[model samples]
Target: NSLAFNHDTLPQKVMFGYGKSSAFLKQEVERRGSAKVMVIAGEREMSIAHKVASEIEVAIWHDEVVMHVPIEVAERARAVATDNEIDLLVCVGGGSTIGLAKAIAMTTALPIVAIPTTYAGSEATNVWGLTEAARKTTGVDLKVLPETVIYDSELTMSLPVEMSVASGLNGLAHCIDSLWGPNADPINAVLAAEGIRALNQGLPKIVANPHSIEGRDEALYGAYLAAVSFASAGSGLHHKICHTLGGTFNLPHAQTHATVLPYVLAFNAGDAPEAERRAAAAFGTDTALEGLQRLRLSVNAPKRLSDYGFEASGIAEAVDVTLEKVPANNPRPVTRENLSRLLEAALNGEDPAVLS
Candidate 1:
């Protein structure tokens, strides 16, 4: 086979350590000469945000983060940034907080310093999403990627176990999504594989012990790689379907990714031999689907779509929405019949390895 692929590395700086956010945060703002820095976070992570806030002279402490990053909320936050003449932005929470900052940055072209407290992994990617009119829209731009990403495992120690598991698995989904797509290349594909391996190694440790720094570090490393790979390789069928399910049905974010991943792998792995082989190697299992299912069960992730309010009745609408977005890059052809079958198995939480 001829060697042919495209690969481009994102231009960004990373500072990863335990309990190093404040020091790095202060230095970066000073280096950039940012006079007015707006710190964004939600009520749930307000205390951690304050810790980030205290490290620098915050122009504004914006704490109105919401799930899916509503367009109205993004507008309000952008207005706040403009009114304050905020030259710099800092986010101190999970996907919601970082996404709000990204939404504002997309238009204002402001730089960001991200301190992620979950395994959502948005910090390392340029993809920004906003929900408007009950639909989610995502676009990629270098402006949306954080100029600096500080992954301090210390902050993630307090994350609830259930959330940690689901969020980590969500990162795992990113890794799998990268393995087969138009942008899939050798470098990013290897990164995605290592990301999967890190999750497989770290998830069970964190499940048994939430405050384990080793576990948190490994998981955060996995998330960083996941986002990096995903940023370049782009989303595939799995991410597209998750967007529809989460937006249309109002299902939980991370849980939906975790619940749907194995089924998606089962659907696509057979068609993409190289992707499946690498995925299985990273998972340390006989097949890509098997490894995903084993790690999922070991971490006690969400078992069924029904657990998160998804219903069989909603599958038709989901297929219609998904069909609107062609899964041309997916290893497997996506059709109404195949998509419906996949969703049914997902809803039932069937054993993914055996699914036909």
Candidate 2:
């Protein structure tokens, strides 16, 4: 086979350590010479946001951030930034908050500085999604990429074990799916493999000891590599299906990714043998799908789409929705028959081999 692939890197700075966000934010703002900055955080992270805001002067603060950037909410937040003349956005929570900031940047062209407290790795990517009328639309733009990402493990200490597991698995999904995603190249392949190894090694330690800073650091490092790889490689069937299920049915985001990934891996393994071999090597196992299944189960991740409120009858519509996006980019041709079986296995929480 001839060697042919394209690889590129986004221009961004990363500061990774414990308890570095506040100082990092201060220094970055001064470096950019931006006088007006707004804080966008979830309600739960208000105190942390306030602490960070006190250290640096914030012109506006919005804690009404919600999961799955609703169109109305994005418009509302965009209006807030416009009305305040905010020059910079500091997103201080997980995927949703950074997603909101991305939604605003989608139109306003404002720069973002992300401080991610969960393992969802949206901070490192320029991909953005917004939901409207039960459908989600996603697009990629370099303007939405964070200028700097401050990954402070100290902020992740308060994350519950269940949430930590789900978020870590979300990152793992990126690493696994990116191996065969569009634009997959040698550089992203290396990053995705190492990302999987780090998450595999660290997630169990985190479950055993949630407050272990070392474990948090390893997992965060994994998530960073996962996001960077995902950013470059782009997404495929796994993400398309998850977006269909989550957007149409209002499922929990990270949990949905964790539940569906193993089944997708099973479906694609036969067609994408080289990617599968890399995945197994990354997970230190012979069977990549089963290894992922065991790893997810070990962390007590939710196994069934039924658990997240998906219904048996909705499978057809979900498949149809996913069919709109999956055919062109997936490594394997996703037939309606096989895709139905795959969705059925996931919906019932059956073994991954049911799809295989």
lDDT of each: 0.89, 0.88
Off by over 4 Å in 2: none
Clash totals, every prediction: 0, 0
**TM-scores, one per candidate:** 0.96, 0.94
Model 1 CA deviation exceeding 4 Å by range: none
Q: What is the C-alpha RMSD of each candidate to the true structure, in Å?
A: 1.5, 1.8
- Tell me, by lDDT, which candidate is best: 1
TM-score of 2: 0.94
At residue 239, what lDDT does model 1 achieve? 88
